[PDB]
Design an enzyme around this catalytic site. Structure first.
Site, short mmCIF file in Angstrom:
data_model
loop_
_atom_site.label_atom_id
_atom_site.label_comp_id
_atom_site.label_asym_id
_atom_site.label_seq_id
_atom_site.Cartn_x
_atom_site.Cartn_y
_atom_site.Cartn_z
N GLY A 114 76.40 -67.50 72.63
CA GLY A 114 77.61 -67.13 71.92
C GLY A 114 77.81 -65.65 71.63
O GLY A 114 76.89 -64.84 71.72
N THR A 115 79.05 -65.32 71.27
CA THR A 115 79.44 -64.04 70.70
C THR A 115 78.46 -63.54 69.64
O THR A 115 77.86 -64.33 68.93
CB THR A 115 80.84 -64.17 70.09
OG1 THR A 115 81.82 -63.90 71.09
CG2 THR A 115 81.03 -63.25 68.91
N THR A 116 78.29 -62.23 69.54
CA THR A 116 77.32 -61.72 68.58
C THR A 116 77.95 -61.49 67.20
O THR A 116 79.11 -61.07 67.09
CB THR A 116 76.47 -60.51 69.15
OG1 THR A 116 76.06 -59.62 68.10
CG2 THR A 116 77.24 -59.75 70.24
N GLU A 176 81.98 -60.17 66.76
CA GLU A 176 82.60 -59.71 68.00
C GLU A 176 83.60 -60.76 68.50
O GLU A 176 83.23 -61.90 68.77
CB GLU A 176 81.49 -59.45 69.04
CG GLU A 176 81.91 -59.43 70.52
CD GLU A 176 80.72 -59.62 71.48
OE1 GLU A 176 80.47 -58.70 72.29
OE2 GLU A 176 80.05 -60.69 71.43
N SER A 226 77.61 -67.92 65.33
CA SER A 226 77.65 -67.77 66.78
C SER A 226 77.29 -69.08 67.42
O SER A 226 76.37 -69.76 66.96
CB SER A 226 76.63 -66.74 67.24
OG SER A 226 76.79 -65.50 66.56
#
Ligand SMILES: Cc1ccc(CNC(=O)[C@H](CCc2ccccc2)NC(=O)[C@H](Cc2nc(C(C)(C)C)no2)NC(=O)c2cc(C)on2)cc1
Ligand SMILES: [Mg+2]
Ligand SMILES: [Mg+2]
Lengths: 212, 233, 196, 198, 236, 222, 222, 204, 196
Positions: free
Chosen positions: E22-24, E39, E67
């Protein structure tokens, strides 16, 4: 309310009044106390206006469903017993209704069942139901012959309602007349008591208790 | 099925040209015992709504809790919670009305009468009543309890119909309300001298005034009154 | 209703609030609850207003008659006439009366006649719905042989507490001072006694 | 009060039941059968509260017929009456009891005895030479105490009932409109459909 | 409900992979609060800017960011909210952060006990100010959580963690809320290094005793631009 | 003990014309001897060219109207936006009421619109669902004052042709909308003079094939 | 019924009279009112006799299971807590009024429990109709630091006050002594001061006096 | 109209030397109306005897319930239920219907087949055990029964003498009660044999 | 029953009488109405003994579970738990509870939960049948920030007046002192307080 149904030589006569009350308030004079269930079945309504209208409209729904399921008009016995069984489920909760299920079938011939919210179900030739029933019985019982001509039986029913409309404070409005044969029910009109009383008085020479 | 125990008396209100005023005294009675004297029965919700409540105090406090977390819930996943998607007076009322009517329908009422006073975001004044039976109505003036019988006649002399509202200024209206609160203290055995008053103005926003007192009272005529009929001294 | 009578050095004082209610509605905020049945015999009424007025009217009648024939009646005699009326008709009376008076022989006296129609001679007496809240204060602050100004203080303080707590009580504090000097009517307005 | 009588003679059981159905100020019917055949040798008669009466009888009937068809066998009168008793004794403590009193008249073919069982709405069962429910019992019990014999024929039993009915027509306040009479013997169940003007 | 022979739970382990994917997102504790940041991958030019809010509030005082599977995160927050409501109802006071942590802990952990439920595919970073201080927490798909000075999860977690480690070492005295907001903007920019095939939007929130009175609020307008600017500066 | 019911007064009147109908009510809302509001409407447009009033206990009345409006909304959803005919609405209202047969809505409810042929229609219901189509109907506090007037002036009852001696009834005719509004306004001025719970204002809703039009009239405020 | 409990310096004693009644009639002239909850927790009841009995057995049962599960001697405060929670749940409809007394590893304990679920602790207590006659003796004679002998005398005297002065109480005195040292000692019919005097005549009938209609032998076995 | 009075009836049981007796009336009435002359109120389940007074529908039901339970007891325990244990079964069965009781006053009589000692007990309608060893009474003439017994009874009576005592007690109590009488049956019980006698009594 | 709680300089003191009655009979003359629900959170009970004991037992349990998980609860939190139980079950409870606790951050606090289940935070509070007789006295005599010995005296005096006039109150006066220093039990006997 006064409703009656009797069996005779030429089928069944069903006659009812058309008055609704709340206490001493006359609520309506044009109420329909006969339900046409199918071309061969009639129901009459006495007691609580809603109870009767609701559950008898429902009775029509359940009768139609039997036609689709069994490809055959429901018997009067079984139509009455649907109403009777439903009403019994509710016993004690204070439903108030007294009704007659009337019609012809090939198996039974002309049949009348009286059904009330106590759960009582009776087969019989002659019933009057409602606050005016005793007034109806009196005229009806003392003029009833099995051999009555259709014309005379029609009148007898009509006249018996007139009787009860007159003496019962909670009856009146008009008479609705039905005749039931092998060919199904035939409606024999609406008859305002306003007009009918005077006509009957003059033509029959009765109601001598009445001024003018 | 229950009975009110600790109670609050009348809540009164009216709408003027720019907003709405609402007032309620700071007392919690226990039958005839004037038991608790520091009780706030006006509840601000956001800064466009005040909910005035009379009747059972335990139930009042439950309605408080319900409103506070109604504000919390509205903020959840709501970036516009302090703007276009802020709570409105009409929303807060419809919620309370719903609750009230469900509670009476379960034969377990919230033993209260409530007035919701506020300004809608389009500028319209909001003033509406609901109570323990779930009965609701709106009027240029509204009042609960004894307020209904004594305050309303006084406030209606200022605003008799809708068209009187543009003619009524905040000063006039606050005067009418502060005067009706004196009358209520004269004749309501379940009333208190101390009260709170709130104004919701479409320009000024919410002004909330605490610790007001009934002032300029007439008692001097009392001294001349002796006996109950014939007595002279 | 909050009502009391206190004996002191020179005589007796009667005090009362001025509120009468039907339910939560104040029918009258300025009632005079202090009722004279003779020059220097007065009473405080509680219970049914109809009952206590009718009773007071009959007692005043008996003491006017007494006075024409036998002279000035004692406070005890006043109390007895009240008791007689209250006891004998206990089935159709809700009446709580405090009797207070001054003559030169017996000085200052207080009698209390509660719901049953019994009589009780007392140094001071409280009654009315509001009295219940001041039982502790009064028992703690009462002394015998108090001066006039001290007694007015005691009644003023007591009745303010009773008015503060009882919703049936309120309005002004009325008093009547009964001494050899004569008769003095006193009044105290809310702005004075609340600040105590 | 409707009239429900039962007399057990030597070779049969006879049940007489009133024909009137009255609601309020009207006799609605003068030819009511207050009886349900439970099996070819067992007959039940009933009186009590308006709707409960038929709903119960027909529920008892359904259960007995079911049992018969399942076992290709007829239950004894002793067995049927125990079924009914237990049903009533259940009902008495439910949310809405059945207010029905019954007489069960059967011929036990295994024993070759006729049998009469009296059961009230509470579920009180007893076997008797003769029985009744309601007010009618207050006249018939003593009458039969005098005139009944254990070894009477069916024709004799019918004369005993005639007395009972005539007595009830002299002394009971209400017009019960005569009785329907039915006999349960070794040959099953039949109706004496001519009791009124005879 | 299955241990593998090494004592680990292989379904939890695969959940972790989904998180790593996942996105940070990050959280930084400061001396009187916590800051959160994420993010937001710009899939398309068609996304409405500032309008697909990832950060979520719990009660009034608790921030949550995660995330992994975004739906799994939302489910968790919904439950956190009921667990907050239930606590306040009974005990009056708003829920302390350690207490709120165990509430999510046990719930997430419960989803590792039964064969008919799958574990959650998120790691959640959450915290806020309660009666005795600021608290930062991170909770893994197993239900494991601890307190943190700084926390990171997602595709760029390693680069972000290294940056956090640097701050902790170079600010033993404590960081300021105002500052942590800028620093979080820097760290998300640095962390975007390991996910740069897409353009991204920055989102930051904070809960500071002196900057928000201890309530959770989003960072918008002026302060958000100052943070972007500061982060743009230390990349050129 | 808690009493779940109240009575907020008011009075409603429905008249059907040849190709229109009216449903009128006063705007006054009351409790015991107090006035809650001088302008609280209780006749509502419900969409599909149906107006509805549910007079009596206003809490129950509001719940019912709310539920019928919702019933109309879902009718549209479930049945491809079909117009809800007046008879179909009526039957649906029966079911709403009867669902509460053992804890009833204390209201006299009246609805008005046009039947499938474009004729004016009025139906009225008792508190538990019993209903009937009629030419005219008054409901509420002052129904007993008004119904007899309507029997006389709308249905020409007890009226005869002069000189027929009493042998030929005055023939029943349809009334124009001007004629009907005259009757409504007169019924309500009469009712206001004689019933303490009637006053303040009169709001009439008229339904034609062109939609729903609204008129308002001042009434005596005492 | 008179039941008492008295704490002494090394334990606790309970006593009760032995009359049970049905309205004004004496049903059992020597019933046992002192029940065992566990070997060293004893109980005395008044009110509905089936209720005190059943409640004693239920909690005695659960106390045994608890004792086995915990490998510990049962504690009085556990009987107390279990009794009061059960009684409370039933809102007084289980009309059990109990004096509970025992020794356990924490010492000696005396409590009373009312049908609604309220408990009180005391040094001396009484319940039942003889309650007031017993209390009068206890308030006259109780002192702190009673010996074992003194506590038995006191408890027994107080039951006696009930026997003589209360019509609901009579016959004999049962005692149970629970000391911190040894086993609980149950002294059934500790006093028997109400022996029925010798009848004036024997009422033995000459055989054949009763008339018999028929006679048969009844079969038990199969 | 109080359920313990609708039908009427009485039971009494006594202990003697190596024996017990249990007797009952035969009346089943509906208020004033005598209905049945043959309604026995004593039942046996093995060597264990149960008498039941009260609402006759509950009397029947209880018999049918204790037959059920003692049958299943016998099948599992491979021996007949004893008097002491039956008593406890009765007691806990009644208490189980604590808030909708059976309206009955049951009486247990029998000899322990192992210890040989006579045993009687009674119960109130919710199963409270009355543990008198001398005599136990029950039903609409209980007061009368109590007076007859306390007067007539003496301990250690012989079976033949015990018959006379229990019979006289029952008969004379029955005759001072409007709802009891109409016949009576006495069971005399020894460890080896049981005699059942029907008594001749006033039929009014 | 006469029960009170008073906040002061160092903390809070709970006081109560020791009489429990059924009708006119004193079922127990040495009752303990001062109920520990946590180290330094106590309450006083009035109303149904069954309901108040059941309630205090459940709250004690709830707070023990609280402590294990969240640390020591605030007095407010303890009051909230009482309120939840008293409000949610009001149709079936007759419970009047005064909650009083010492806390390091908030010092002494008092909460009163009367019959409805509402909560009121107060400087001091009084309840029970006996409290009606001391409203006036208590309102006249209570000051904030009293010293320990002054508050003991205020409670001692107040309750002795309540005992003097209420038949349902009587016996010994029990107090519980709640400060930073710990927890102290005080008892006062008739011979001591009747003299006042
Ligand atoms: C279709 C139809 C109409 C009319 C009838 C004849 N019954 C009737 O006319 C019965 C007689 C009274 C009665 C008897 C027995 C039980 C309940 C009520 N009347 C009826 O049911 C009335 C009808 C009605 N009520 C009203 C107002 C709005 C109350 C003024 N206007 O008309 N409703 C009620 O009595 C009623 C009352 C409540 C509450 O719910 N329904 C039969 C069949
Ligand atoms: Mg006052
Ligand atoms: Mg006789």
């Amino acid at each position: 309310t006064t409703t009656l149904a009797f069996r005779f030589q030429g089928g069944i006569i069903v006659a009812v009044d058309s008055r609704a009350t709340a206490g001493n308030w006359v609520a309506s004079q044009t109420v329909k106390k006969v339900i046409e269930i199918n071309p061969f079945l009639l129901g009459t309504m006495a007691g609580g206006a809603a109870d009767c209208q609701f559950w008898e409209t429902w009775l029509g729904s359940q009768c139609r469903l039997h036609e689709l399921r069994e490809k055959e008009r429901i018997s009067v016995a079984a139509a009455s017993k649907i109403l009777s069984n439903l009403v019994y489920q509710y016993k004690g909760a204070g439903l108030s209704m007294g009704t007659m299920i009337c019609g012809y079938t090939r198996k039974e011939g002309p049949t009348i069942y009286y059904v009330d919210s106590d759960g009582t179900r009776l087969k019989g030739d002659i019933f009057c139901v409602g606050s005016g029933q005793t007034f109806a019985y009196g005229v009806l019982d003392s003029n009833y012959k099995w051999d009555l001509s259709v014309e005379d039986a029609l009148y007898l029913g009509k006249r018996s309602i007139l009787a009860a409309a007159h003496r019962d404070a909670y009856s009146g409005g008009s008479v609705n007349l039905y005749h039931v044969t092998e060919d199904g029910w035939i409606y024999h009109g609406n008859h305002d008591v306003g007009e009918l009383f005077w006509k009957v008085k003059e033509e029959e020479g009765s109601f001598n208790n009445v001024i003018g | 099925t229950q009975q009110p125990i600790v109670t609050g008396t009348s809540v009164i209100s009216m709408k003027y040209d720019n907003g709405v005023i609402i007032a309620a005294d700071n007392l919690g009675s226990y039958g005839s015992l004037l038991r608790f004297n520091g009780v706030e029965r006006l509840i601000p919700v956001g800064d466009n709504t005040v909910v005035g409540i009379s009747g059972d105090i335990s139930d009042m406090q439950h309605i408080e809790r319900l409103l506070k977390d109604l504000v919390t819930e509205n903020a959840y996943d709501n970036p516009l919670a302090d703007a276009e998607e802020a709570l409105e007076p009409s929303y807060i009322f419809e919620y309370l009305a719903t609750v009230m009517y469900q509670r009476r329908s379960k034969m377990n009422p919230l033993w209260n009468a409530i007035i919701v006073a506020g300004v809608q975001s389009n500028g319209d004044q909001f003033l509406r009543y609901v109570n323990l039976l779930g009965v609701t109505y709106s009027s240029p003036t509204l009042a609960t309890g004894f307020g209904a019988h004594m305050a309303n006649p006084l406030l209606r002399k200022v605003v008799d119909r809708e068209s009187d509202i543009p003619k009524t200024t905040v000063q006039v209206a606050e005067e009418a309300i502060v005067n009706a609160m004196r009358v209520l203290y004269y004749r309501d055995a379940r009333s208190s001298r101390n009260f709170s008053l709130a104004i919701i103005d479409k320009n000024t926003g919410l002004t909330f005034k605490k610790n007001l007192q009934v002032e300029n009272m007439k008692w001097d005529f009392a001294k001349d009154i002796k006996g109950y009929g014939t007595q002279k001294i | 209703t909050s009502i009391m009578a206190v004996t002191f050095k020179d005589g007796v004082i009667l005090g009362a609030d001025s509120r009468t209610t039907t339910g939560a509605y104040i029918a009258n905020r300025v009632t005079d609850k202090l009722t004279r049945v003779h020059d220097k015999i007065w009473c405080c009424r509680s219970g049914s207003a109809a009952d206590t007025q009718a009773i007071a009217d009959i007692v005043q009648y008996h003491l006017e008659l007494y006075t024409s024939q036998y002279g000035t009646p004692s406070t005890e005699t006043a109390a007895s006439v009240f008791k007689e009326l209250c006891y004998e008709n206990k089935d159709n009376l809700t009446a709580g009366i405090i009797v207070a008076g001054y003559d030169d022989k017996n000085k200052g006296e207080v009698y209390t006649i509660p719901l049953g129609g019994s009589v009780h001679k007392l140094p001071y007496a409280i009654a009315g719905s509001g009295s219940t809240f001041i039982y502790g204060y009064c028992d703690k602050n009462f002394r015998e042989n108090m001066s006039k100004e001290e007694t007015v203080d005691f009644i003023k303080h007591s009745l303010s507490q009773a008015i503060k707590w009882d919703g049936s009580s309120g309005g002004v504090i009325r008093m009547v001072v009964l001494t050899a000097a004569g008769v003095e009517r006193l009044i105290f307005y809310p702005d004075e006694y609340e600040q105590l | 009060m409707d009239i429900i009588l039962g007399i057990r003679v030597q070779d049969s059981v006879i049940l007489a039941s009133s024909k009137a159905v009255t609601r309020g100020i009207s006799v609605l019917k003068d030819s009511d059968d207050k009886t349900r055949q439970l099996s070819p040798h067992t007959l039940m008669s009933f009186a009590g509260e308006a709707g409960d009466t038929v709903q119960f009888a027909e529920y008892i009937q359904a259960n007995i017929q079911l049992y018969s068809i399942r076992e290709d066998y007829e239950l004894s009168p002793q067995a049927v009456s125990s079924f009914v008793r237990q049903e009533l004794a259940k009902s008495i403590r439910s949310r809405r009891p059945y207010q029905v009193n019954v007489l069960i008249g059967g011929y036990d073919k295994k024993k070759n005895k006729p049998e009469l069982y009296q059961i009230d709405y509470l579920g009180t069962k007893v076997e008797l030479p003769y029985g009744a429910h309601g007010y009618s019992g207050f006249y018939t019990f003593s009458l039969l105490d005098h005139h009944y014999r254990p070894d009477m024929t069916t024709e004799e039993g019918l004369d005993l009932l005639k007395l009972c009915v005539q007595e009830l027509e002299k002394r009971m306040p209400m017009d019960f409109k005569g009785v329907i009479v039915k006999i349960v013997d070794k040959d099953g169940i039949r109706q004496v459909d001519d009791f009124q003007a005879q | 409900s299955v241990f593998s022979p090494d004592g680990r739970n292989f379904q939890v382990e695969y959940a972790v992979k989904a998180v790593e994917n996942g996105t940070t997102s990050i959280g930084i504790k400061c001396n009187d609060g916590v800051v959160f940041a994420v993010e937001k991958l710009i899939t398309s030019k068609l996304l409405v800017p500032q309008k697909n809010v990832k950060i979520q509030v719990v009660d009034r005082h608790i921030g949550c960011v995660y995330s992994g599977l975004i739906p799994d995160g939302r489910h968790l927050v919904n439950r956190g909210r009921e667990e907050a409501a239930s606590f306040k109802k009974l005990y009056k006071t708003p829920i302390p952060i350690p207490a709120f942590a165990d509430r999510l802990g046990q719930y997430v952990q419960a989803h590792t006990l039964y064969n008919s439920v799958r574990p959650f595919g998120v790691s959640t970073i959450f915290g806020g100010v309660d009666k005795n201080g600021a608290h930062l927490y991170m909770l893994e798909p197993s239900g494991s959580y601890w307190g943190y000075k700084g926390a990171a999860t997602g595709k760029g977690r390693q680069s972000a963690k290294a940056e956090l480690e640097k701050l902790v070492d170079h600010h033993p005295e404590g960081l300021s809320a105002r500052e942590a907001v800028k620093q979080a903007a820097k760290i998300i920019y640095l962390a975007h290094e390991d996910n740069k095939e897409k353009d991204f939007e920055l989102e930051i929130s904070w809960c500071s005793l002196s900057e928000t009175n201890g309530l959770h609020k989003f960072v918008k307008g002026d302060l958000l631009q100052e943070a972007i600017d500061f982060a743009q500066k230390e990349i050129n | 003990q808690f009493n779940p019911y109240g009575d907020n007064g008011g009075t409603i009147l429905g008249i059907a014309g040849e190709d229109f109908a009216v449903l009128a009510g006063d705007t006054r809302n009351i409790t015991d001897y107090s006035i809650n509001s001088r302008y609280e409407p209780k006749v509502f447009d419900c969409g599909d060219n149906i107006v509805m009033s549910a007079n009596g206990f206003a809490a129950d009345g509001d719940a019912l109207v709310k539920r019928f409006k919702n019933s109309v909304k879902w009718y549209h959803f479930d049945h491809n936006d079909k117009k809800l005919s007046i008879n179909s609405a009526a039957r649906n209202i029966q079911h709403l009421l009867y669902g509460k047969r053992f804890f009833p809505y204390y209201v006299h409810t009246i609805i008005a619109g046009l039947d499938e042929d474009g004729k004016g229609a009025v139906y009225s219901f008792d508190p538990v669902g019993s209903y009937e189509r009629e030419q005219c109907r008054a409901g509420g506090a002052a129904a007993s004052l008004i119904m007899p007037f309507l029997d006389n002036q709308v249905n020409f009852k007890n009226q005869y042709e002069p000189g027929t001696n009493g042998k030929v009834k005055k023939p029943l005719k349809y009334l124009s909308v001007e004629e009907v509004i005259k009757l409504v306004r007169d019924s309500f001025t009469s009712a206001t003079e004689r019933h303490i719970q009637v006053g303040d204002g009169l709001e009439i809703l008229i339904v034609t094939k062109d939609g729903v039009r609204k008129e308002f009239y001042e009434l005596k405020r005492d | 019924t008179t039941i008492v409990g008295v704490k002494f310096n090394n334990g606790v004693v309970i006593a009760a009279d032995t009359r049970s009644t049905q309205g004004p009639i004496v049903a059992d002239k020597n019933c046992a009112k002192l029940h065992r909850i566990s070997p060293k927790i004893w109980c005395a009841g008044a009110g509905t006799a089936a209720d005190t009995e059943a409640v004693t057995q239920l909690i005695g049962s659960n106390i045994e299971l608890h004792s086995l599960y915990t490998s510990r001697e049962p504690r009085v405060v556990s009987a107390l807590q279990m009794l009061k929670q059960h009684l409370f749940k039933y809102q007084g409809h289980i009309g059990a009024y109990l004096i509970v007394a025992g020794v356990d590893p924490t010492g000696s304990h005396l409590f009373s429990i009312h049908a609604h679920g309220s408990t009180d602790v005391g040094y001396y207590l009484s319940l039942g109709s003889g309650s007031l006659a017993a209390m009068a003796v206890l308030e006259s004679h109780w002192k702190q630091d009673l010996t074992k002998e003194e506590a038995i005398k006191l408890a027994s005297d107080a039951i006696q006050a009930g026997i003589w002065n209360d019509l609901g109480s009579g016959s004999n005195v049962d005692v149970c002594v629970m000391e911190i040292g040894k086993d609980a000692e149950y002294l059934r019919n500790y006093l028997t001061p109400n022996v029925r005097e010798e009848k004036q005549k024997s009422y033995k009938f000459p055989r054949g006096t009763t008339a018999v209609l028929k006679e048969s032998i009844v079969n038990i076995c199969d | 109209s109080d359920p313990s009075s609708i039908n009427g009836g009485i039971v009494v049981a006594m202990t003697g030397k190596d024996c017990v007796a249990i007797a009952c009336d035969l009346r089943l009435g509906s208020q004033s109306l005598g209905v049945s002359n043959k309604f026995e109120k004593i039942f046996h389940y093995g060597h264990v005897f149960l008498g039941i007074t009260g609402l006759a529908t509950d009397v029947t039901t209880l018999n049918e319930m204790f037959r059920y339970k003692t049958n299943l007891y016998k099948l599992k325990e491979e021996r007949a239920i004893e008097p002491e244990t039956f008593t406890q079964l009765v007691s806990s069965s009644l208490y189980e219907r604590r808030f909708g009781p059976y309206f009955v006053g049951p009486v247990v009589a029998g000899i322990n087949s192992k210890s040989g000692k006579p045993f009687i007990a009674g119960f109130d309608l919710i199963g409270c055990i009355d543990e008198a060893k001398d005599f136990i009474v029950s039903g609409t003439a209980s007061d009368q029964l109590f007076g007859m017994c306390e007067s007539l009874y003496e301990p250690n009576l012989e079976p033949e003498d015990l018959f006379e005592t229990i019979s006289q007690a029952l008969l004379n109590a029955a005759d001072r009660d409007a709802l009891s009488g109409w016949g009576a049956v006495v069971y005399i019980i020894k460890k080896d044999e049981v005699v059942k006698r029907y008594l001749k009594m006033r039929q009014d």
